[PDB]
Amino acid sequence: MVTAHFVLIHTICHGAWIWHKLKPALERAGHKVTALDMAASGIDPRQIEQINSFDEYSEPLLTFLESLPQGEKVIIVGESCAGLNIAIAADKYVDKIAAGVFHNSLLPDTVHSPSYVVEKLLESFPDWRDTEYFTYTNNTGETITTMKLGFKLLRENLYTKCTDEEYELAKMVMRKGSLFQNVLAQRPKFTEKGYGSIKKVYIWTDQDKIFLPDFQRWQIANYKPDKVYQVQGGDHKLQLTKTEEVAHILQEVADAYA
Amino acid sequence: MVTAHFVLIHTICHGAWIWHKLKPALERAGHKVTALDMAASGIDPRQIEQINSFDEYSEPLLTFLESLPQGEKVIIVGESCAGLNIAIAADKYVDKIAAGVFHNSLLPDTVHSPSYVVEKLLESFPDWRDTEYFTYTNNTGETITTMKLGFKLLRENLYTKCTDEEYELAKMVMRKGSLFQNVLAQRPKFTEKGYGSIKKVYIWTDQDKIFLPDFQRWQIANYKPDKVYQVQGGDHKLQLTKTEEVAHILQEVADAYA
């Protein structure tokens, strides 16, 4: 068994804290784990209204990869919307990425616009329930839509099978988030030499109540991952409801690609 | 029953998230629970360097108490340094407070300087180990010392018996904090009419590895609580290591004072 360095990237609205179970589980097997707050996420001090694009939102990941000792490679694990962070990172630091791992995650491709799978997600799940939407104006006058995830959506669609303590934790540290969808729609496509070339492992459960089974299967058919690991049971937050099974899969990713 | 409403107040550097286990446990017994971030704590958007005193730090507690409808009383539960928040609040909103509950907490009095029990704490536990210290200048030219709690202090002295997952969580959301000790040392003493008159319940364990038994026993002798509950085992974070037992005690507090 290989040991690897895993970089865990939370989804919009969330923070590094979502990985509080997975990080020590991985460390038990001797892996290195880095869990980062993206901009205006977790306890990052920036407010979302000062962030102008999904690329700017991903700054902490890019900054960390720039500082990685030369010659080292990482496995980037992204949950939910963080597949976009993986693609952004791979188009700057392909040489530093052993694999990208998608965890009930958006799976961008190279032949469509970066906003493509966001559009498809929202078509598949258009009603975010008690989630509240806000707008602000960015750097160049664009209106950015932010969301505060609703408590019922959190309880029933994101944390469906998580403990009550985990759900209360989520409410206690959740931040606003944004897809920056209109800015993604004008962004250059992810490149073949960068994102297109990395190994891609897709982890998912058909019990996910926001990234629904027809949507996730559509993503898999749209851009075939190198490996697909389906996990039985759990919910959208497999790193909480199926922590050990995720850690075991991540070991297999290290054995294959690290 | 009269609904008991517990207002849970974290310690410096922490946030409402520290109560993510105790809050659903209390709600299982039918109580109302409010867990607040203090200024520059948890996901509060202010930075500590803009805060000028422990009273300013207490603003979210004071603003919440202001919002309470007439006739509604709360039981304020403070952990560790939050005993100071209880005294500050009680001097402004005594009629809204059914009781203050101290949870391995500083227990200020009314006859010494507000900084008195902070000085005694630091005499008893002077070495905060790998903690890092920083300074800034406040509202009146006082230099404020802030701290970033060190990982070893967190692991061994605060979260001694907590799960690895809880310790990892703590590292992912911890903020800077300050005792504002030199500002407390110039603050008017807490009043009899306000803080002195609230009912006070002292919960502690002699296995606390930062608020040590000679210090905690000294506080009890210095300022007699109405009730003392000593919990066997656990650690400084009894709301994590002894959640159900703390909830049982808080039921007794509600029976006595709600």
In whole angstroms, what is the distance from residue A186 CA to residue A203 CA?
29
Quote the CA–CA distance of B139 and B51 in Å, as a whole number: 8
Provide the 8-state DSSP code for A48. Answer: G
Cβ contact (<8 Å) for A45 and B42? no
In chain B, the largest separation of any two C-alpha atoms, in whole Å, equals 50
CATH class of the domain comprising A5-257: alpha beta
What are the extents of the domains in chain A?
A: 5-257
- Scan for tokens 């977790």, then name that residue: A42
CA A14, A17, A22: angle at the middle one, nearest 5? 115
Joined together, the tokens standing for residue A61 give 């990941």
Interface probe, candidates A8, A18, A20, chain B, greatest B C-beta count within 10 A: A20
SS3 B147: strand
User: CA–CA distance from A236 to each of A203, A228, B234 (Å)?
Assistant: 11, 16, 33
Q: Choose the closest CB to B17 out of A19, A23, A169.
A: A169
Active site residue B197: no
Instruction: Write down the H helix ranges in chain A.
Output: 22-28, 54-57, 59-67, 83-90, 116-124, 151-152, 164-173, 181-184, 213-222, 238-241, 243-257
Nearest Cβ partner of B43 from A19, A164, A175? A175
CB contact under 8 A, B45 and A42: no
Whole-number Cα distances in Å, B159 to A163, B171, B178 = 21, 11, 19
- A175 CB neighbours in chain B (<8 A) are 43
Cβ neighbours of A127 (radius 10 Å): 8
In the structure encoding, which two tokens stand for residue A199, read together? 């190994």
Q: What is d(CA A74, CA A100) in angstroms, rounded to the nearest whole number?
A: 9
Sheet holding B200-204, edge to edge: B32-36, B5-9, B74-79, B97-103, B200-204, B227-230
**Catalytic residue among B80, B105, B115, B178, which?**
B80
Technique of determination:
X-ray
User: Could you tell me the two tokens for A100?
Assistant: 């990208």
Known catalytic residue at B67: no
Inter-chain CB proximity B17 and A173 less than 8 Å: yes
